C-alpha cells in the first residue's frame, strides 16, 4: 500500500551501498526523469544521505 499524495511517505536511505543501475536498467518504469543529476552518472556519484 502506497501513501496518499496529501500524506506522502518519506524514508531515509543511508549508511549503505547503492546500485542505481538495477533501477534504471528495468523496463517497467514509465518515467525516470532526473534533475541536477544524470541517470547514468548517478551510479558513479556518491551522496551524504
Amino acid at each position: 500500500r502506497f501513501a496518499s499524495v496529501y500524506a506522502w511517505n518519506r524514508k531515509r536511505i543511508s549508511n549503505c551501498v547503492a546500485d542505481y543501475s538495477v533501477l534504471y536498467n528495468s523496463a517497467s518504469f514509465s518515467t525516470f526523469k532526473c534533475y541536477g543529476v544524470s541517470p547514468t552518472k548517478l551510479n558513479d556519484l556518491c551522496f551524504t544521505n
Binding site: 523496463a27 514509465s30 541517470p39 547514468t40
Partner: protein, 49 residues
C-alpha cells in the same frame, strides 16, 4: 541525405531525439548531439498489428 526507418512503440517516439537515453536511444538507434535532420513518425496499428 540518409533516410532511416524502423518501427517502435508509441511510448518510444520520445526517445528518437538528440541527447535522449533509454533502451531505444541507448541500444537501438542513437541520434548525435548536433543532429541536423528531421524525425517523422506515424501510428501503424492498422498495418503492424
Amino acid at each position: 541525405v540518409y533516410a532511416d526507418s524502423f518501427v517502435i512503440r508509441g511510448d518510444e517516439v520520445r526517445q528518437i531525439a538528440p541527447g535522449q537515453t533509454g533502451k531505444i536511444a541507448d541500444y537501438n538507434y542513437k541520434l548525435p548531439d548536433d543532429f541536423t535532420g528531421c524525425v517523422i513518425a506515424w501510428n501503424s496499428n492498422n498495418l503492424d498489428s
